[PDB]
Write an enzyme that holds these catalytic residues in place. Sequence first.
Site, mmCIF file in Angstrom:
data_model
loop_
_atom_site.group_PDB
_atom_site.id
_atom_site.type_symbol
_atom_site.label_atom_id
_atom_site.label_comp_id
_atom_site.label_asym_id
_atom_site.label_seq_id
_atom_site.Cartn_x
_atom_site.Cartn_y
_atom_site.Cartn_z
ATOM 1 C CG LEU B 6 -2.263 0.643 1.188
ATOM 2 C CD1 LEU B 6 -3.035 0.089 0.032
ATOM 3 C CD2 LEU B 6 -3.050 0.411 2.432
ATOM 4 C CB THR B 8 6.379 -0.301 0.665
ATOM 5 O OG1 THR B 8 7.744 -0.531 1.043
ATOM 6 C CG2 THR B 8 6.318 0.457 -0.653
ATOM 7 C CG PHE B 11 9.369 1.869 12.409
ATOM 8 C CD1 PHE B 11 8.831 2.131 13.668
ATOM 9 C CD2 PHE B 11 10.738 1.652 12.297
ATOM 10 C CE1 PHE B 11 9.639 2.188 14.798
ATOM 11 C CE2 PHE B 11 11.560 1.706 13.421
ATOM 12 C CZ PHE B 11 11.009 1.973 14.676
ATOM 13 C CG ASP B 130 6.827 11.005 5.443
ATOM 14 O OD1 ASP B 130 7.421 11.623 4.535
ATOM 15 O OD2 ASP B 130 6.276 9.895 5.272
#
Lengths: 624, 624
Positions: B6, B8, B11, B130
Site C-alpha cells: 500500500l 511501503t 518503519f 512525513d
Amino acid sequence: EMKERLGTGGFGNVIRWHNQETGEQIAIKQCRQELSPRNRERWCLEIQIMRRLTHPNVVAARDVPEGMQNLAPNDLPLLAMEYCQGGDLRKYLNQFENCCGLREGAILTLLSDIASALRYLHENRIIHRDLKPENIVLQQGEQRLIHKIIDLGYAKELDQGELCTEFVGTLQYLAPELLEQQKYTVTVDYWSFGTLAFECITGFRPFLPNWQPVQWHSKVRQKSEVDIVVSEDLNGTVKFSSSLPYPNNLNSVLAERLEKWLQLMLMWHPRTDPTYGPNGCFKALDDILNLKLVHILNMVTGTIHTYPVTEDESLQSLKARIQQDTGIPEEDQELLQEAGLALIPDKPATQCISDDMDLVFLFDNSKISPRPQPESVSCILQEPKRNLAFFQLRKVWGQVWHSIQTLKEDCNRLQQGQRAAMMNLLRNNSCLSKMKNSMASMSQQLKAKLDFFKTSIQIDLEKYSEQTEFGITSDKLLLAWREMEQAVELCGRENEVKLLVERMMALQTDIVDLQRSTLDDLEEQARELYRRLREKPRDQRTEGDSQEMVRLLLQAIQSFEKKVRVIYTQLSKTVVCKQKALELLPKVEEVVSLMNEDEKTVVRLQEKRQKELWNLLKIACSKV
Amino acid sequence: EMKERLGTGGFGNVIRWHNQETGEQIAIKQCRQELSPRNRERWCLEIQIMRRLTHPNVVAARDVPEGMQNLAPNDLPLLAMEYCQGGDLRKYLNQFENCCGLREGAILTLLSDIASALRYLHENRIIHRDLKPENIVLQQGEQRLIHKIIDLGYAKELDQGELCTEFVGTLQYLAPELLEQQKYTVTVDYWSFGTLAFECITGFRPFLPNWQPVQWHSKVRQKSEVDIVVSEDLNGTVKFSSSLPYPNNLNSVLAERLEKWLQLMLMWHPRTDPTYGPNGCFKALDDILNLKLVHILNMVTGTIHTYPVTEDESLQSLKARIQQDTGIPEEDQELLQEAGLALIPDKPATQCISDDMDLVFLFDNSKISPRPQPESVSCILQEPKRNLAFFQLRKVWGQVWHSIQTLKEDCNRLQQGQRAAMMNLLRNNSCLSKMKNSMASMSQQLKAKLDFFKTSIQIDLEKYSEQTEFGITSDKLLLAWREMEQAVELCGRENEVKLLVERMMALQTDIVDLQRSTLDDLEEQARELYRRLREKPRDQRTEGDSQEMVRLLLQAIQSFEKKVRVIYTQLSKTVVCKQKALELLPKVEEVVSLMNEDEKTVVRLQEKRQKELWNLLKIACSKV
C-alpha cells in the site's frame, strides 16, 4: 525587324517585319533571286493582284514600308501585306486530339470561310490552284476564328497567265488535270478544296499514303467514279469506296449530306451541284452550311436523332416526324432541354438552337439498358488478328481512344438524358403537385367549419325543444330533424385525407432526397500512348504491336456497359416516381373534390333544417 | 499471500495479502528486522495507535488474519489493516495530462480530504510529519474519490514520544524546522500539506524544486517573507515569487484566493494564522472550500467571470454586480444556461449551480469578435528566443500543450456557448411561434364562415325584394337585421394574418438556411511530443530545443482565431433571426388575436339573428 514567314515558299519568300516602333506586324515577300524577264514580268503581276480585290479569309496587301523600300536584295518591287498571327492549318490538323480526322462542327468554319474566299477570287477572275492547308492561317477574330489564306505565288490569272511554274513542296493536292496535263479551268480549285475538306473531316484525302507520282495517277484515276475513300484495310488490300469514312462524328445528317458534295466537288470538268449542273462550291456548300437542324435524343435507347427543320416548322410537325422513326406516339413524348424544362408548343421547332446542346427526349413507360456502338473497320478488322502491325498503328491505335472517348462522350449524352429526364420530374412535382397538395390542407379547415354548424343550428335546435306548447303539436317535419344530426356527424372524411398526406409527405421528400449520386480515366490513360508514339523517334517503324492498346479499348467497354447499367438503373427509378405522382396527383384531386360536394353543396343546401321554421312560424299563426 | 505494498517503507514493510478464499484484500506491516528494545517498544505503539481512532481519508486498522499469524521470525506482533486499491497520488500528479499542475477543481477533493484527515489526527494528539504524496492513496468511493492515507511509521504521538527518527525518502517535503533542527510542534504538518497542495495546484512543488536537501536550507530560508514559488527563469537566475504560478488553471477567484492560504499555511512555528480561527488548516481552508461561487461568460468578448454569491444573493444583486465589471446595463442582460433556458428572477443565487455547468450570458446589439488572452511568463518570456533550453524544457514544453489544450478547452466553452445559444432559438420557435403560427391558420376558417352570411342574410335579402310573403310584423327588430349584414361583412381578416405568414415564412426558412457549425488535431499532435520526451530513455531527456513545439502553439492560435470568427459569424446570424422574430411576433400576435374577438365572440353571440325566431314562434301563437 524580320522573323519567320506567314506562308513562305510560293514564288519568292514572305517574311514577317516589325517596323521598330509603332507595333504593326507587316509581311514582305522578296523574290528568291531575279530570274528571266518573263518571270519578273510575271511577278509584277502577282504583286499587282494582291493590291486589288481583297476580303477576309484572304490576306490583304499592305503598302510597302514608307522607307524600308530601299532595302531590297532585288531592285525589283516588293510585295507588302498584312500579317496574320497564328494558323498554319497543318499545325491544327496535326494536333493529337484532332487526330483520326477531327470530329466537330469546327469543319463548318473552314468550309464557310474558304468558300467565301474561293468564291471571291473565282468571281474576280483568279484561280489559286494550289490550295494546301500549309497556306491557310487561322487568324483570330471576334468570336471564332477566320480562315485566312497566305501566299498566292501558285496562281492563275484568267486574263493573262500564271506565275509559280514549279512545285515548292508536296503536291498531295492540286487537281489531277492540273498535274502537268493540258489546260485547266477553275475546277482545279474545287478538287483542292474538296480533298482539303475531305481531310478536315475524315483526317486525310482518298489515296493519300502511296506516294503521289507513282501509280497514284494510275490508280486514283482508275475506277472510283464519283467516289472518294481509296485507302487499304487490313494488309495491302487496296480498296476504294464512295462514302465518308467512319472515324469521324461530324453529324448524323450532315455526314451522309455533304458526303455527296465532297463527292461531287471532287473531280475535273463535271465537278458542279447536280441540282443545276454548272458549279458546286458557290451555291452547293452554301445551302448545306446555313441549314437549320435540331437534335433529339431517343432516351428509349437508340441515342442521337437529328432533324433538319425549317425557319418555322411547327413543333406539332416534329413530334410526328420523330414518332415516324423511333415509334412512341405523340402522346407519351416528353421533351426536356438539358435542364428538365419542357419545350414550348406555341413556339416553332426553331428554338432548340439559338446561337454542345441538344434536346433530350423521353417517353412513357417504366425504364432495358442497351448502348449499341457500331465499330468501324480497321480496328474491328484487327480484333481477330492481334498479329500487330509495323507502324500503321500510328492511326489505328489513334482511332481507338477516339472510340473510347466516343464511349465516354456517348455515355454523357444518355447521362444528359436522365440528368434532364429526372430534372423534369422535380418540376411537375414541387410545383403542379407539392403546391396543390399542401393547399388541399384547407380541407381540415373546411370540415372544421362544418362543426360551427352544430353550434349555430344545433344550439338553435334546442330553441324549438323548449319553445314548446303551441307549435310542435305537429312534430311533422321535426322527426328527422334530430336523426339528421346523427347523420351529418357520421360523415366527414377529414381524417382520411390526413393519413394520406402524412404518408405521402414522405414521398414528397423521398424524391428530393436524391439529386445526389473509371471510363473517364481510360480515355486519358490511352491518350498517353499516342502522345508517346506520335512523339516517339523515327527509328521504330518496326517492332509493331497493339496488344496493350486493345486491352484498353476492351476495359473501356467493360466499364461502359458498367456505367450505362447504373444510369438506366437510376433513370428507371426516377420514372417510377414520376408515374407514382402523375397518377397520384389525381388521387388527391378527386378526394379534395369530394368535399366541395359531399360537404359544401351537401351541408349548404341544408338550410332547410333551418328553414323548416319558416312555415312553422306562419302555419301556427293562421290559426286564430 | 504476499503481493505489493500500500504505502511501503516507513518503519517496517506493508504487504498486500489475499486470504486464499473469501476475497478480502488485507494488508500486514511486518517489521524490517527486530531492532533495539526501544524501537520495538516504539513499534508496539504504532500498531497500538492504528487499532484506535479511525475514519475515512485514513486507513483503518484490521484484525490480524484469523489463521496465519507467522511468516516472520520476530518476537514482535503484526500490524494488520485494510487494503485501499488504487491511489499512489504521485501516479496521478505524474500524469501527462495533470502535468503543468492539476488545472481543475479536483484539487478541492485533495484539500477537503487530507484536511479532514490531519484535523483528525491533530485533535487526537498525533503528528504525521512525513506527509508525502507517496503515502496518499485515492481509494474509490461513492461518487468521487477518497484521499486515504497509508503507513504512519513516521508519525508522532504527542504523548508517547516519536515513532522512528530517520531521514530517508526524497525528504523534499517535511517542514524545515523538522529538518534535524530542534523541537517541532504540529506546524510541521502544515508545511507538508502546503507544499503537497502547492504541487497538486502548480505541479512544481514550489519552494525550491529538485534542489539538494543541503544547498536548500540556505537558499530557502533566505528572505522570501510570506513567499512561495522559488525557481529560476531563462538561465539560472533564481527568483522568489509571492503569487503562485499563473499556469494553475483552477479558478479565477479561487486562484488568488487560497493563494494566500497556501502562502500562509506554508512555514514554521508562528506560520498557523488564527487571524480568523484556531490555526490555519482547521478554519482557514474550511471557509474557502465551502464557499458558493458562480460563473458568468461575457459573450461580449472577455470570457470567464466568476462571482462568489451568498446562500441567497438575490439575482437582482448579481445582475448589478456584473454590470459593474463588464458594463452592459441590467436591461440588455440575457442570461441563458447551456440550454437556451433563461434564468429565474424570483430565484436567488444558487440558481445556476444545480449540483462546465456555468451560465452563458449575452447582451443586446448585433455582434465584432475580439477576445482577451494571457499566456503566462516562462513561455512568453521564451518567444523572443526559442533556442537550446538545456533541460528546463521538461516543464517549459509542458506548459505549452497545456496552453494549447487550454485553447481547445476554451474553444469548446464558447462552442458550448452557441451550442446552448441557438438551442434556445429552437425552443422559442417550434413552440411559442411555430405553434401560434399554424394556429393562425384558422383565419381561413373565420373569413370562410363570414361567407355563410351572404347565404343566410344575402339570400334572406331577396325576401324583402320580392316581398309578397310574411317576413315582418312590426319592422321592430328588423331594422338592424340588414345593417348587421353590412357589419359582419366589414370584419374579417382574410388578408391580415395571411400577409404575416407569407412574410414570416421567409424567416422560418431563413433560420434553417444556416447550419454550418483543426485545433482538435493540434492539441493531440502536440501531446505526441511529451509522450515521446517524458518517456524518452533515461539519457536523452536533456538536449535543447523547442522550435517545433513553438511552431505548434503558433498554429494553434492561427487556427483558434479561425474557428472563433466562424462561431461568432454563426452566432451573430442567429441573433439576427431572434430579433427578426422577437420584433415580428407581437405584430402577428395581436392580428391573430383580433380574430378570436372580432370574429369568434362577434359572430358567435350572433345566435340572436337566429334566435329572434324564438319569440316570433310564441308571440304569434298567444293569439290563438
